[PDB]
Amino acid sequence: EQAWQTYINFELRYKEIDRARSVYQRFLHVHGINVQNWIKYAKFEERNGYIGNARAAYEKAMEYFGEEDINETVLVAFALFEERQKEHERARGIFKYGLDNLPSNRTEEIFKHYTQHEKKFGERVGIEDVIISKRKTQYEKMVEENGYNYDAWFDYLRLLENEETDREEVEDVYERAIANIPPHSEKRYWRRYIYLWINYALYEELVAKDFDRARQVYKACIDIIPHKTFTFAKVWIMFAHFEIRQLDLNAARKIMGVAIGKCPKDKLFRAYIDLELQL
Amino acid sequence: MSFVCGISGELTEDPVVSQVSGHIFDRRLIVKFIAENGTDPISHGELSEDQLVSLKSGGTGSAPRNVSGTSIPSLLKMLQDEWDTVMLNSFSLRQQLQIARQELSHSLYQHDAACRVISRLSKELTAAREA
Amino acid sequence: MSFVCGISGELTEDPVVSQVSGHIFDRRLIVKFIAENGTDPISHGELSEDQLVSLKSGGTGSAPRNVSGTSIPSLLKMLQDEWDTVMLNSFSLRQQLQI
Amino acid sequence: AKAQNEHLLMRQINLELMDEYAAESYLQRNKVMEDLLTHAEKELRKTKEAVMEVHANRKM
Amino acid sequence: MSMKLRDILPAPVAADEAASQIRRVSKEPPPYGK
């Protein structure tokens, strides 16, 4: 490659642009496999103002590397070219086509440049849409990196709730959160984890307003907590008061009495006593 | 020759057609492809040398090629293509007419609207003229 | 692709080849020939309708219209004048064969 | 008079399409026809030499 | 082949002639005899 560059530079020093063009078109027949040679040609055609050739050069690059085995570096370079030619609807097009056709383990460059292009040349409803989709992808990555990064879940759940995303998808991601049961019998590790369950029930009761499903959430808490080694009074109190709502004290008493039965604990007694005083 | 090979893309001088492919090859190409791979390049069906026939032209009785551009087949062909266009055109017009003719029959309220105006205005008159 | 029938000399939309000759035909013509004579029209080898190999490659493109061929009555007029020249040709052949 | 009205309409549609594509298709037609002429002249020249070769083998 | 960017993308609206349309003696002797 370094040899062909010196021939290009030779012709350019005599301002023989059409000669230097012909060297590139031969150069890509030999060293075409290196994407940077293909981008350098389109930068050359662009910098000499042959913008129709520069566009065709990028379009041929996509064709060469294959529009099934899509290459991010061409897409980014091509998109940033159209952006710099003020073909912003094409620039946006190229970024969106990239995200639509590539797996999200790549595309981090397409994303960051798309949330550069849109963040300048877009508009608020577009700027926030791409940043959310970036963040969802970013949380989804750092969840796959660990699973037990509960703060990634608490953000991810909050984000999806805040953006009013569809119930099935917010409910699904909660189920993925919940599968990260702490590998310990010690309450210290559960103290952070357990608010995934509590927030899931709060979401199901307040936002989805599907109380039968909310009951199943609370029930599934009690099937997961060990109870013999430790207990959370939090979940028993909340599940009792959830059955005081819907006017089912005959269930709330059963829930709270089993809490006393399995695991006498001072806040459980206090909270049950206080409930019976208020009744 | 006027035959173009499907695989090499050249105008061949050794035209051969294979029964499974229904396609035209160079003899020198297809025999080695059969030798190395035993397979039709187009359909990926099996091939063997007995499935191959070689094309010829200009034998005794072979009619002169018509080059005048007009012909009875081609005129009957384009008269047929006119006819198909006019019928599918006429069919969509007939469909359009049926839709328009259907709804304007359903829309024939106008005499019953007139009776409602008569009923409303006569009520109005008796309600206007009572003082 | 483009093909011409050995019998008619016209382009053909259904090119076919006999297994007993190199020459190619429009299917309905060679079938009608076989239905009379049971033989290859050029090699005179005995031929049957199943010994025909069909080129699935696309037939010859349509002949462009003449400007006079842009109207249906003028196509019929053109078809009439075309037909008369075809019959005079066929009549000229039987005279030439006698001579 | 109704029948001629539609023939003239279809004529106009044909002529307008013909104005888009006749120039290309006639050019394409000639490019095919040219090939036949050169290939026919190739066959003519090839057979002339073969007739001449037979005169050679006869004289020899 | 896949659905091309040739087909999916909007046509370029900033088209311009120079941008995308400006692409890329001797004597003889007199004849024989004369």
């Binding site: 075409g32 064709e63 | - | - | 594509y21 | 692409r23």
Partner: peptide, 24 residues
């Protein structure tokens, strides 16, 4: 159905645009 040769117009336009243009 009649002017189906427009495929040959775009192909010859495409082939023409391969002049002074890249590999493959």
């Amino acid at each position: 159905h009649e002017y189906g040769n427009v495929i040959k117009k775009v192909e010859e336009m495409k082939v023409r645009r391969e002049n002074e243009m890249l590999a493959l």
